[PDB]
């Protein structure tokens, strides 16, 4: 009622006052004396040319050589990036796929989309073929992300304002995260796989706690829907890519916004965000048909990856940082180095 | 310079490529239609002759169709509406008799404006179905159409009232040259609905064929 609304207003005012008090100097002032990385030159080393429709997601394997990509033709393809060979080709039940995942052990892959089901596939079977291990159902909205906690735990992000943690062996949600007021479109596991963040359509990102399930912090500052999120390699920060042509860097400990990656030239949103191995560079996949390598410490464009004829929808960096793979809406992938 | 195992892996990859090419060639011959409406507009009725998305598969005149019904996807429409960019046509179904109150004709107009004047569906021809024709005739025999259209000047006759409603619905689109809207008075318990859909699909197919040769 009125008193509860007043209490919420005063609590948010106190939160804003505390955030303003804890802010003493933006990192731009601290970083002015560091040497810029300069121009970044990237060349298309390989071009995976197997798909036949729009590509919506891809995930690097833990060995930094195998990767799995999902496209609208109802096919899951596992690539050998070194030789551009097709290790596997998994025909999905529903061609409307908006996410993909690769297990850290490499035994399983995950798929999901408009079918509201996050299926799991068994790569290493005695029969020699890939079968579906378990279909996870219970989301009332479309699937937008899915990450493998381990061989037995998977956490998914749905379009019904809910994030859930599953259990492949049993098939039911262990925990349910309900803090958002809009569609959730992204997910990013912490380096220690103890926390994670989600990017929702209400222009806010919440940091959860998978062990018990509750929103630790809520980060705001965006002006439109958040389309992609990614943890900093240190695990104490993350970056968000939204539809207002901006990328922003938040810090978990300080609970504030650090920098914004914006320019007057670009006006389209950001569809994918990923860091580098050392966290110095930020890669964002715009709708301008090319990616920008933002210098994450100085917010200056260090280079452009312009080799795609359509909107870049997925973008990832290997564990060792040796390559970055971008998949756009033309049925093409490109390995840059 | 490849070893024996590398050569065998390359052969397996080539076989996979052949299978993928065959699958894509077979899939490119299937007509994909997106079904839209206001929930109670009558999508279940039109889909009857042949927990997220629901796909309906049927064949007419040796042509393989595929109708997708979003149905209960109660989420952000603009967040997943671009997945359907590239369908042969859009079947927007609305009820002619649904104009009483709780009014919903304005909601259908808003939905049609949102779908037709969309950046993704710039060139995708939209097929408009106006069902519940008998119920609309019964309603118009007693209740005048002025309860829905304040700026209406006509008699309470089914023909001119239906023509006026169709004209108002058709005048919603902006791009009147790169996109065509097809109007059909369905609810006739015949095969006319699927024949009309087939004719529109054939026109779209001819338009697409007139693009690969540069004749466009």
């Amino acid at each position: 009622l009125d008193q509860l609304r007043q209490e919420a207003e005063q609590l948010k005012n106190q939160i804003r006052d505390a955030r303003k008090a804890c802010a003493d100097a933006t990192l731009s002032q601290i970083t002015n004396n560091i040497d810029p990385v300069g121009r970044i030159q990237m060349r298309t080393r390989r071009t995976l040319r197997g798909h036949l429709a729009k590509i919506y997601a891809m995930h690097w394997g833990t060995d930094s050589r195998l990767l799995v990509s999902a496209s609208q033709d109802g096919k899951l393809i596992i690539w050998d990036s070194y030789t551009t060979n097709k290790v596997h080709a998994i025909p999905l039940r529903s061609s409307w796929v908006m996410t993909c995942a690769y297990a850290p052990s490499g035994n399983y892959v995950a798929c999901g989309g408009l079918d509201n089901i996050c299926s799991i596939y068994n790569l290493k079977t005695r029969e020699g073929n890939v079968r579906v291990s378990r279909e996870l159902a219970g989301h009332t909205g479309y699937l937008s992300c899915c990450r493998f906690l381990d061989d037995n735990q998977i956490v998914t992000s749905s379009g019904d304002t809910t994030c859930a943690l599953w259990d492949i062996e049993t098939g039911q949600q262990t925990t349910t995260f309900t803090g958002h007021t809009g569609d959730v479109m992204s997910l990013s596991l912490a380096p220690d796989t103890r926390l994670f963040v989600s990017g929702a359509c209400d222009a806010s990102a919440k940091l959860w706690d998978v062990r018990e399930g509750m929103c630790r912090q809520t980060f705001t500052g965006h002006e439109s829907d958040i389309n992609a999120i990614c943890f900093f390699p240190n695990g104490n920060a993350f970056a968000t890519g939204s539809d207002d042509a901006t990328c922003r860097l938040f810090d978990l400990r300080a609970d504030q916004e650090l920098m914004t990656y914006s320019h007057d030239n670009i006006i389209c949103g950001i569809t994918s965000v990923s860091f580098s191995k050392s966290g110095r560079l930020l890669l964002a996949g715009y709708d301008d048909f090319n990616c920008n390598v933002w210098d994450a410490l100085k917010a200056d464009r260090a280079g452009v990856l312009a080799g795609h004829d359509n909107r870049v929808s997925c973008l990832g960096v290997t564990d060792d940082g040796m390559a970055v793979a971008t998949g756009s809406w033309d049925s093409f992938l490109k390995i840059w180095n | 310079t490849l070893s024996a195992e590398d050569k065998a892996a390359v052969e397996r990859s080539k076989m996979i490529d052949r299978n993928l090419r065959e699958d894509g060639e077979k899939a490119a011959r299937e007509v994909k239609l997106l079904l839209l409406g206001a929930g109670e507009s009558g999508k279940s009725t039109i889909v009857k002759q042949m927990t997220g998305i629901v796909e309906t598969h049927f064949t007419f005149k040796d042509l393989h169709f595929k109708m997708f019904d979003v149905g209960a996807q109660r989420s952000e429409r603009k967040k997943w509406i671009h997945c359907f960019e590239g369908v042969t046509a859009i079947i927007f179904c609305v009820a002619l008799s649904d104009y009483d109150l709780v009014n919903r004709m304005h909601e259908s107009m808003k939905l049609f404006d949102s779908i037709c004047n969309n950046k993704w569906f710039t060139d995708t021809s939209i097929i408009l179905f106006l069902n519940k024709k008998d119920l609309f005739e019964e309603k118009i025999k007693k209740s005048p159409l002025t309860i829905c259209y304040p700026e209406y000047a006509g008699s309470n006759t089914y023909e001119e009232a239906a023509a006026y409603i169709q004209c108002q619905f058709e005048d919603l689109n902006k791009r009147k040259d790169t996109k065509e809207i097809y109007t059909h008075f369905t609810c006739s318990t015949d095969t006319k609905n699927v024949q009309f859909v087939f004719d529109a699909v054939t026109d779209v197919i001819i338009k697409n064929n007139l693009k690969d040769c540069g004749l466009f």
């Epitope: 060979n85 290790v87 596997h88 029969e127 020699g128 | 024996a4 065998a8 052969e11």
Partner: single-chain antibody
């Protein structure tokens, strides 16, 4: 489960044209390459033929080229091998080994039961040095295998496979590509080495480990096995 059963052996007069067959059931036969490996009674294994997935590549041993034919029937899930002009050297026990090739796969993983046939009266040389060695439970025995050409390819993986033939049953795969441990093999077995120097160690062995151990190369055809190191006691 996976099952490879062969039939067609028996007694053949010299100059016959008898055909062998092998029926497979329990796995996706259409995506596996099939080999034939014979074993003369008081001898070791010897590669015979090979046919890939889709029958696109077929290799033959130099001894049987021109007299043997290998073919598959994928819808029937059966593998054939037709022999013509049999000679007294062709007396052996024939196996139906299977192998699937991709990145990280384990070829020669399952071996058939084996059928016996009796007829009435630049290759890499793989030498296994010692032919017999007595062992006791609780010890650690290392088997040494050697090759002429270096088995380290430019990719970085050495193609050497370890097999174990228990008394009275088919051989089984232990280690593929000289370092990886096969599926179902306990941690006890371990292997390492380098080019032209390969060793397999059995730390803290026990019973049901007796039998001859064979080492095989896969760098280039024809595949060659070792003499076989026998373990007794």
């Amino acid at each position: 489960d996976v099952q490879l059963v062969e039939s067609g052996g028996g007694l053949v007069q010299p100059g016959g044209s008898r055909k062998l067959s092998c029926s497979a059931s329990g796995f996706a036969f259409s995506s596996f390459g099939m080999h034939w490996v014979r074993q003369a009674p008081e001898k070791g294994l010897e590669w015979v033929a090979y046919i890939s997935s889709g029958s696109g590549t077929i290799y033959y041993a130099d001894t049987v080229k021109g007299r043997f034919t290998i073919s598959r029937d994928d819808p029937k899930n059966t593998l054939f091998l037709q022999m013509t002009s049999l000679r007294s050297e062709d007396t052996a026990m024939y196996y139906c080994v299977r192998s699937i090739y991709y990145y990280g796969s384990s070829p020669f993983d399952f071996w058939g039961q084996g059928t016996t046939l009796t007829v009435s009266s630049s290759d890499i040389v793989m030498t296994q040095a010692t032919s017999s060695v007595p062992v006791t439970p609780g010890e650690s025995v290392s088997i040494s295998c050697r090759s002429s050409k270096s088995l380290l390819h430019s990719n970085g993986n050495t193609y050497l496979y370890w097999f174990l033939q228990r008394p009275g049953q088919s051989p089984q795969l232990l280690i593929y590509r000289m370092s990886n441990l096969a599926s179902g093999v306990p941690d006890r077995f371990s292997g390492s080495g380098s080019g032209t120097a390969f060793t397999l160690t059995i730390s803290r062995l026990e019973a049901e480990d007796v039998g001859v151990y064979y080492c095989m190369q896969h760098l280039e055809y024809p595949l060659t096995f070792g003499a076989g190191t026998k373990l007794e006691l």
